[PDB]
Amino acid sequence: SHMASPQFSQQREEDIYRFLKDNGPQRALVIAQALGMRTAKDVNRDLYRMKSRHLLDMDEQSKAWTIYR
Numbered sequence: 174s175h176m177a178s179p180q181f182s183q184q185r186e187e188d189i190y191r192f193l194k195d196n197g198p199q200r201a202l203v204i205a206q207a208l209g210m211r212t213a214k215d216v217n218r219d220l221y222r223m224k225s226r227h228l229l230d231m232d233e234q235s236k237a238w239t240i241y242r
Contacts, residue, residue, distance in 0.1 A: 179228050185219045190228060190240060198232070198239035 181187040185208060192207050193199060201213035201220055210216055213236075220238050223229035230241045 180226065182222075183219075185216070186223055186228075189216065189219055189223060189238075193229075193238060193240045198237045200236050201231075201238055204238060 179190055181190065188208055189204055192204060199207075201216050204220065205211065205213055205216045208216065220229055220231065224231060224241065227241050230239050231237065232239065
């Protein structure tokens with residue numbers, strides 16, 4: 174295929190992926206502030222949604238969100 178591989182539903186998910194592609198693995202709180210949110214809970218919905226579709230992966234060790242391969 175000649176087009177890009179991931180699927181985003183909204184601007185948040187698209188920013189989350191692009192952000193973690195550009196800096197590498199970061200915690201949900203880093204992602205939240207980078208979108209202009211306040212808390213890790215404001216992003217967690219988008220973050221876990223992308224993990225459920227093969228786009229993100231959280232680390233159990235420090236809650237570091239890393240783009241799924």
